[PDB]
From Swiss-Prot, chain A:
Cystine pairings recorded for this chain: none
Pfam families in UniProt: Ras
Disease (UniProt): Ectodermal dysplasia with facial dysmorphism and acral, ocular, and brain anomalies: A neuroectodermal syndrome characterized by linear hypopigmentation, alopecia, apparently asymptomatic leukoencephalopathy, and facial, ocular, dental and acral anomalies. Patients show no intellectual or neurologic impairment.
Record PTM (Microbial infection) O-AMP-threonine, positions in chain: 35
Subcellular location: Cell membrane; Cytoplasm, Cytoskeleton; Cleavage furrow; Cytoplasm, Cell cortex
Protein name from the UniProt record: Transforming protein RhoA
Keyword check for Transmembrane helix: no
GO MF annotations, alphabetized: G protein activity; GTP binding; GTPase activity; myosin binding; protein kinase binding
EC number of the protein: 3.6.5.2
A GO cellular component entry from the record: ficolin-1-rich granule membrane
The organism's taxonomic lineage, starting at the top: Eukaryota, Metazoa, Chordata, Craniata, Vertebrata
Swiss-Prot/TrEMBL catalytic activity: GTP + H2O = GDP + phosphate + H(+)
Listed Gene3D superfamilies: P-loop containing nucleotide triphosphate hydrolases
UniProtKB/Swiss-Prot annotation, chain B:
Full protein name: Rho guanine nucleotide exchange factor 11
Reported tissue expression: Ubiquitously expressed.
Domain of life: Eukaryota
Subunit structure comment from the entry: Interacts with GNA12 and GNA13 through the RGS domain. Interacts with RHOA, PLXNB1 and PLXNB2. Interacts with SLC1A6. Interacts (via DH domain) with GCSAM (via C-terminus). Found in a complex with ARHGEF11 and ARHGEF12; binding to ARHGEF11 and ARHGEF12 enhances CDC42 GEF activity of PLEKHG4B, and PLEKHG4B, in turn, inhibits ARHGEF11- and ARHGEF12-mediated RHOA activation.
Part of the full-length chain shown: 714 to 1081 of 1522
Gene: ARHGEF11
Residue ranges occupied by any DH domain in the UniProt entry: 21-210
Compartments (UniProt record): Cytoplasm; Membrane
Start and end residues of each PH domain: 252-353
Function statement: May play a role in the regulation of RhoA GTPase by guanine nucleotide-binding alpha-12 (GNA12) and alpha-13 (GNA13). Acts as guanine nucleotide exchange factor (GEF) for RhoA GTPase and may act as GTPase-activating protein (GAP) for GNA12 and GNA13. Involved in neurotrophin-induced neurite outgrowth.
Length: 178, 355
């Protein structure tokens, strides 16, 4: 069997854990959202190939520069998330996360995930950013950051609606195999 | 499965959404804990014990992999027993603060940060060792693929399982932050949870440091064998004469990484520089060696330099030798990217500001 390892990195509170939770369960937590996702192996098929994808959350490790990298060795694909309702989280991609990930993960493919897309169109969210002279990240900003950092692909999704989640891991697995 | 749906199926009715969301989060803590105790016993059983009683490797090498597995299992076990005793006096959990503090504040804090620091500080290196050993020792590589085959490993490898202590520790302020947001404000309990939360971040900073030093110490030991300060016991300028005996081993490292030295008229130079406490150092990667060679000294004392940022060049920056003796000496150094130039500056100015 083909064992690959995924590590999902990004700013705190920009989706990371929520995203991993739906995917593995194929359903958005109804009654109660969990805080803790545990290291877990997911079965995924792609291009008629069966993969065992080790899923690694990095939640909680965002402030601890020398704990974080204990998570990076032997990694086949990195999901870098920002949140679309947070143009700050995005500028942290080129400035905090890629330089890091390229240092500890030479030549490991990166897929740029734009999370909380279900919010590019939310009047409350749009106001608050309009408060700091900001507005929800547009798709070409994502697409452009993706070609800027040398990502394998750019994918937007919504943990809420489940829209684009499945499509995100499939890409990541395609990436691992390459 | 869930708290509303299992325990308290009858008593669910008389409660508020905040008091429910609170019990859901307290329950996640209690369960993910017994889940982590089980992950720890899987290590103990499937790995530690069998590797010990079968001599898969030297006792000394094992010691570095599982320094204190039994003390770790006892930390978490003792707590999970407290947890189990509370869950007892009613499916509805009232005050949870004393418990948290009994694990994350005071002496309890000291115990935990020492016990988790010793278990994690070395991990990174020992995992390198195991990778090596799987490659070179067929006996080892078979033990490994026999143990990881076992059902209770959930198809995970040793190297995955073992990092779950560090991971669990990092989940504790998230779990607290959650319980806090669904706890009545102005309570002693609300206040105490916050002390507990802030104390977890403090434990984490303590472990973060343990790892940094342990890793950095072993790295520096590495860099010292490869070091070539021949061209320095004679030299050219006595600015670099006193560093012919160096020894990185006695210093602390702040930061390291690559850097291109724009030294002469369109003559550059690829370096790998170390930022120690008192010293910036400029080694050139030969192949498997590291060279201290001069003109310019290759070892800047920090208390005597200035950091100065470029305007058009977003990758470059200057360092200036502020000693009266040692002329117009200015090192123009180029980083990987804007982000790398930026971290480098802050660290530098901190280092120097501490000098």
């Amino acid at each position: 069997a083909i064992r690959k390892k995924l590590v999902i990195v990004g700013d705190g509170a920009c989706g990371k854990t929520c995203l991993l939770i739906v995917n593995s369960k194929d359903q958005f937590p109804e009654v109660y959202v969990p805080t803790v996702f545990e290291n877990y192996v997911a079965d995924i098929e792609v291009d008629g190939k069966q993969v065992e994808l080790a899923l690694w959350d990095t939640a909680g490790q965002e402030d601890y520069d020398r704990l974080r990298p204990l998570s990076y060795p032997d990694t086949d694909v990195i999901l870098m998330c920002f949140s679309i309702d947070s143009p700050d989280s995005l500028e942290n991609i080129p400035e905090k996360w890629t330089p890091e990930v390229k240092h500890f993960c030479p030549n490991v493919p990166i897929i740029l995930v734009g999370n909380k897309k279900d919010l590019r169109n939310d009047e409350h969210t749009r106001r608050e950013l309009a408060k700091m002279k900001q507005e929800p990240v547009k798709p070409e900003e994502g697409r452009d950051m993706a070609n800027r950092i040398g990502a394998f692909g750019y994918m937007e999704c919504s943990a809420k609606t489940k829209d684009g989640v499945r499509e995100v891991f499939e890409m990541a697995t395609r990436a691992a195999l390459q | 499965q869930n708290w509303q749906h299992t325990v308290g199926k009858d008593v669910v009715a008389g409660l508020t959404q905040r008091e429910i969301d609170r019990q859901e989060v307290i329950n996640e803590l209690f369960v993910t804990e017994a889940s982590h105790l089980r992950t720890l016993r899987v290590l103990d059983l499937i790995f530690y014990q069998r590797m010990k009683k079968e001599n898969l490797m030297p006792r000394e090498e094992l010691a570095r992999l599982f320094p204190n597995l039994p003390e770790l299992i006892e930390i978490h076990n003792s707590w999970c027993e407290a947890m189990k005793k509370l869950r007892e006096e009613g499916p509805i959990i009232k005050e949870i603060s004393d418990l948290m503090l009994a694990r994350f504040d005071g002496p309890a804090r000291e115990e935990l940060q020492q016990v988790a620091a010793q278990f994690c500080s070395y991990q990174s290196i020992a995992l390198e060792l195991i990778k090596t050993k799987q490659r070179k020792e067929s006996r080892f590589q078979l033990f490994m693929q026999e143990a990881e085959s076992h059902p209770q490993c959930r198809r995970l490898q040793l190297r995955d399982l073992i990092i779950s202590e560090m991971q669990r520790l990092t989940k504790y302020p998230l779990l607290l932050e959650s319980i806090i947001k669904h706890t009545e404000g102005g309570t002693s309990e609300h206040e105490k949870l916050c002390r507990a939360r802030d104390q977890c971040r403090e434990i984490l900073k303590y472990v973060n440091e343990a790892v940094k030093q342990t890793e950095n110490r072993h790295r520096l030991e590495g860099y010292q064998k490869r070091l070539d300060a021949t061209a320095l016991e004679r030299a050219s300028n006595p600015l670099a004469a006193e560093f012919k005996s160096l020894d990185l081993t006695t210093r602390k490292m702040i930061h390291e990484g690559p850097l291109t030295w724009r030294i002469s008229k369109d003559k550059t130079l690829d370096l790998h520089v170390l930022l120690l406490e008192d010293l910036l150092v400029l080694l050139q990667k030969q192949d498997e060696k590291l060279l201290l060679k001069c003109t310019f000294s290759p070892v800047l004392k920090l208390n005597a330099v200035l950091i100065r940022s470029v305007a058009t060049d977003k990758r470059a920056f200057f360092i200036i030798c502020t000693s009266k003796l040692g002329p117009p000496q200015i090192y123009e150094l180029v980083a990987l990217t804007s982000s790398d130039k930026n971290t480098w500056m802050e660290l530098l100015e901190e280092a120097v500001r501490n000098a």
